[PDB]
Design a protein around this ligand. Structure first.
Ligand SMILES: OC[C@H]1O[C@@H](O)[C@H](O)[C@@H](O)[C@@H]1O
Ligand SMILES: OC[C@H]1O[C@@H](O)[C@H](O)[C@@H](O)[C@@H]1O
Ligand SMILES: OC[C@H]1O[C@@H](O)[C@H](O)[C@@H](O)[C@@H]1O
Ligand SMILES: OC[C@H]1O[C@@H](O)[C@H](O)[C@@H](O)[C@@H]1O
Lengths: 237, 237
């Protein structure tokens, strides 16, 4: 059975993350150069500049990097005409029209058994004196809730421990992959599929909240160098 | 004596509201025309367009309207060079550099007895049976809480009644004032100074939250037609 929460913290729905994705055509040798280009066109957005000088995560990420171009995802409310005009000045052309995320409304999640997470680019988590290229459930829940809170400030502090009591992670197998960040830096992380299974006791409000955390992580990326395109995930329900 | 909260919803600080203010020189006849100009220069920001279509509160407000110009406050992260260039195209000159709110850090509030709230433009609250140009404490608290949640979207549902247990409002006197919105609509609202006094039982965490609510209300405006410049408030501690 379902028991619905009456309190102020989990008795109300939380906002669904929103973002914009812009596709860019043009050759750059490394993700380092794509990231630098995006900082350059956002020089008059104070929040971006402050984050960069504080070496905090920027409100955007490079995605789908290759030799022909890349995508930019951002949760800032951007004037897209200005983005196109500034990229064109720098020799880059935007392709198609901006994509506004989320694209579709969600159905009710009653009877949703779990969520599939595909790590599409190599992923690793950073720690003092060593990044860890391995999947840890609690570490991943901390990452995705931090990404949700960056997009949606003002959320109360969720307890990681209490979320984990209602979920189980499994993986048939994960594999390794290499991601070249700069001429001199290549990192080896994990890739592949993890299944997030809800326990039968999962409060119904928590399924939707977990989906929204995963949507935020799909926007921001997971783990180290997420703004460079590491830790890119696809979610399936 | 102070008793500190251990629970997750009031035991952690919430974000301070941030905004940008841009001052514009240029005559337009009515606040209506200023509002229209701002919508026009934000035509490629999907969030603003969608909110305008749904008749939701925009994420900006006209302030300081006079014969020779006005100001725009917004809590969007704006590329301010683009805003200046688009205004200049319409014949408006931006004065000086953008102002980033808040300008200063706050001190500890343990000694703070209350807050002075000055209604600098006419203020009124709207209802189906007609606008009410009168100060009501609970209505004001609901207004400022909603403003804070519009700037800081994840903010949980606070109890208005619980907040009101800890504050007292007073005024020496309040005055009336007229605010012309269009060539065919002028509204009469109240103006003047209200004092918000914290009771001695006020939990420490709540003084800072209330100040943040008032800072959000200073950015957004209070009551009807806030985006047109009505209900502008100035806070002093
Ligand atoms: O990829 C989705 C599938 O992954 C499997 O590991 C699970 O057992 C299935 O329940 C799920 O539908
Ligand atoms: O620079 C990023 C690139 O690093 C290479 O090692 C990978 O094979 C590519 O998939 C990736 O796009
Ligand atoms: O401490 C001074 C304050 O005391 C209150 O009782 C008054 O209502 C306020 O107007 C005054 O600013
Ligand atoms: O249009 C707005 C104007 O309305 C007039 O009625 C007020 O006296 C002015 O203070 C205000 O600037």
């Amino acid at each position: 059975n379902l028991y619905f929460q009456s309190n102020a913290m989990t008795g109300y729905p939380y906002p669904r993350p929103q973002a914009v994705k812009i596709q860019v055509k043009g050759h750059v040798p490394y993700p380092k150069n794509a990231l630098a280009t995006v900082y350059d066109i956002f020089r008059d957005i104070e929040t971006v500049n402050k984050a960069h000088e504080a070496k905090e995560a920027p409100p955007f990420a490079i995605k789908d990097f290759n030799m022909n171009g890349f995508a930019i995802t951002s949760y800032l409310a951007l004037p897209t005409d200005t983005v196109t005009e500034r990229l064109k000045t720098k020799g880059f052309h935007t392709v198609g029209q901006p994509i506004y995320l989320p694209q579709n409304e969600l159905p009710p999640l009653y009877g949703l058994k779990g969520v599939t997470i595909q790590f599409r680019t190599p992923t690793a988590f950073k720690y003092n004196t060593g990044y860890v290229p391995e999947f840890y459930g609690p570490v991943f829940i901390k990452s995705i809730t931090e990404s949700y809170r960056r997009i949606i400030p003002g959320c109360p502090e969720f307890s990681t421990s209490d979320i984990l009591k209602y979920i189980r992670f499994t993986a048939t197998d994960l594999q390794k992959g290499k991601y070249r960040l700069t001429e001199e830096l290549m990192v080896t992380g994990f890739k592949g599929k993890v299944y997030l299974q809800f326990k039968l006791s999962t409060p119904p409000e928590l399924k939707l909240l977990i989906l929204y955390f995963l949507e935020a992580a799909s926007i921001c990326g997971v783990g180290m160098k997420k703004a460079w395109g590491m830790g890119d995930i696809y979610i399936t329900i």
